[PDB]
Ligand binder design. Structure first.
Ligand code: HEM
Ligand code: HEM
Ligand code: HEM
Ligand code: HEM
Lengths: 141, 146, 146, 141
């Protein structure tokens, strides 16, 4: 579980993202697909071009899951259990790809909220996204 | 590295606006804050005991300007990163024994720093070009391990 | 890759004793057992649902022989791994989009398989030579990503 | 925490290593230093040549810690807490290096106990060494 200081920073940052969560996560997914084209092969069923309704819809869902995580930092395994089964068992997502999406979430937050994105906030958000990624890949134990 | 012609001009245009002193201190200090084991290589720069110590360390900040100046030398020689970074690869691999994974982490932090300063200008397309560049710099710096 | 002359002969001597059918099936099946996300690339080989399914999969076992035969082609061309693996780099990067970290994992499993079959013969010195070789093969296969 | 099946495999394997633990870990450390020379810089105070008393002594200590871990699979954070502080806070060991030592432990076990080192045992031991490594680097959260 995240340290107290990191939990505080993550909840502060997420509160400042506010209603921009779905737009920012959709942008993070676009950044991942553009920068790391290997990741596109998990979404052959989507239109991945800019302005994609499927990517926008998906960003909203992923943003909702991250909002749930920020509310359940002490029980991420249970809060995310169905998503862990989806990503590790059904989809077999390569663990490297969670790093790529986490990096693109940090790029997106840094670009949109530069004053808020201090080195300490960066460190706490990196730890939050690592902990979410660890839970989503837990089947690989 | 294989950049399209459009990506070569995006990379060069953004770099022209970079304050290497401000962003280079920021990049190196963020590496040491976010990935604390990297402090092992800089213990001789004085107090690195806390993030606040890292962020106020005059030597870490000055060193970061050197690192970004060297990245800018890469940008001038995208067709020959191996040669441009030969000497530095020897230093980091043969003298310092820095694990080359860390080169990728510093490139990650540089992309984040560019995004912070350039905002809406650091579009997904401009990021993707920089991702190719920092991957190529990392691979080049790791050459003496190969 | 930079192998000493002593390491070049250790590598070639051990490889001369390798059963590429037995050890190649073992290496690929261990990759899919130990790092289960790699099964995503082989779903068209039939049942991969459990480790026991992987270990009895005739296509996975046959494919592993192809992979070790290709490693043996690397061993014959240690001075030109990039060219030896050019076509295969295009396949794995441009067609299959395998993340190149996985190439390192398969090299890890190959070293473990060699240790299992060679015992006391796979000394720390012989391991170190193979570690240089599998790193070079991985880096070569990743070239089309660079 | 490791799954039941993995706990069983790890305790079976460790029991078969038995009194060879100190010798096998010392060999794993030698394999790491020989194969991955970057790791030698954490031990400038040791003689790292073959037959080193310091490496042999160290192997015994690391083997003891692994034996403790195999006995405390449900409370690794507490069982290893002092070692976590040593490795992440005092020594600042790069997380990559735990992967290298874990791989060299698997090479050493595979070489010495080939019949016992099945693909399922390999998978369970890889997960055990990942979990030990995660606890030892937990300060990096
Ligand atoms: C922070 C990391 C992640 C979170 C929180 C997240 C969350 C989610 C959520 C909430 C869903 C929808 C689930 C449902 O409809 O029941 C989903 C589906 C999916 N995710 Fe992720 N995910 C993450 C990382 C990744 C990565 C790294 C990849 C691959 C590069 C990936 C690929 C997929 C795919 C292919 C689907 C199914 C998409 C569809 O058919 O609509 N996810 N994810
Ligand atoms: C990958 C991108 C990197 C670049 C372009 C880079 C560049 C440089 C440059 C230009 C120097 C000064 C060379 C000289 O004075 O001759 C240097 C020194 C150094 N670098 Fe890096 N570096 C990189 C990554 C890293 C990483 C990731 C680390 C450690 C985690 C590191 C640790 C050092 C150290 C310890 C020095 C010597 C400091 C001293 O003067 O005592 N470098 N680097
Ligand atoms: C790094 C060492 C590797 C070597 C030397 C290697 C070698 C080869 C070779 C020789 C082929 C057959 C080429 C042909 O028929 O034209 C092949 C195909 C393939 N490889 Fe690899 N490979 C490596 C790693 C991997 C990894 C790590 C993965 C996935 C996790 C992978 C996935 C595949 C797939 C999916 C095929 C095509 C299978 C099919 O025929 O449908 N390879 N590889
Ligand atoms: C499974 C992983 C590891 C375990 C269980 C382990 C365990 C131990 C133990 C039991 C000690 C002695 C502590 C004491 O005397 O109080 C120690 C010390 C030490 N470890 Fe590790 N360790 C692991 C990984 C690593 C790695 C990957 C490195 C660096 C490559 C490392 C570097 C060191 C160093 C430099 C010392 C102090 C040595 C001395 O001065 O005698 N350890 N470790």
């Amino acid at each position: 579980v995240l340290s107290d200081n990191d939990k505080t920073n993550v909840k502060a940052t997420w509160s400042k993202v506010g209603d921009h969560a779905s737009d920012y996560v959709a942008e993070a997914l676009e950044r991942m697909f553009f920068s790391f084209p290997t990741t596109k092969t998990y979404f052959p069923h989507f239109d991945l071009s800019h302005g994609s309704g499927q990517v926008k819809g998906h960003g909203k869902k992923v943003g909702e899951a991250l909002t749930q995580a920020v509310g359940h930092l002490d029980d991420l395994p249970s809060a995310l259990s169905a998503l862990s089964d989806l990503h590790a068992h059904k989809l077999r997502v390569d663990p490297v790809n969670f790093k790529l999406l986490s990096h693109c979430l940090l790029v997106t937050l840094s670009s949109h909220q530069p004053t808020e994105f201090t080195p300490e906030v960066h460190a706490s958000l990196d730890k939050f996204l690592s902990n979410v990624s660890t839970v989503l890949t837990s089947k690989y134990r | 590295v294989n950049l399209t012609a459009a990506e070569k001009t995006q990379v060069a245009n953004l770099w022209g606006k970079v304050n290497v002193k401000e962003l280079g201190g920021e990049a190196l200090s963020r590496l040491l804050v976010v990935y604390p084991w990297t402090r092992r290589f800089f213990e001789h720069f004085g107090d690195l005991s806390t993030a606040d110590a890292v962020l106020h360390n005059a030597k870490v900040l000055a060193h970061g300007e050197k690192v970004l100046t060297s990245f800018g030398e890469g940008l001038k020689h995208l067709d020959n990163l191996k040669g441009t970074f030969s000497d530095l690869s020897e230093l980091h691999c043969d003298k310092l024994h820095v694990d080359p994974q860390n080169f990728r982490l510093l490139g990650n932090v540089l992309v984040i720093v560019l995004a912070r300063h350039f905002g809406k200008e650091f579009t997904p397309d401009v990021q993707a070009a920089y991702e190719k560049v920092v991957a190529g710099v990392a691979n080049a710096l790791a050459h003496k391990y190969h």
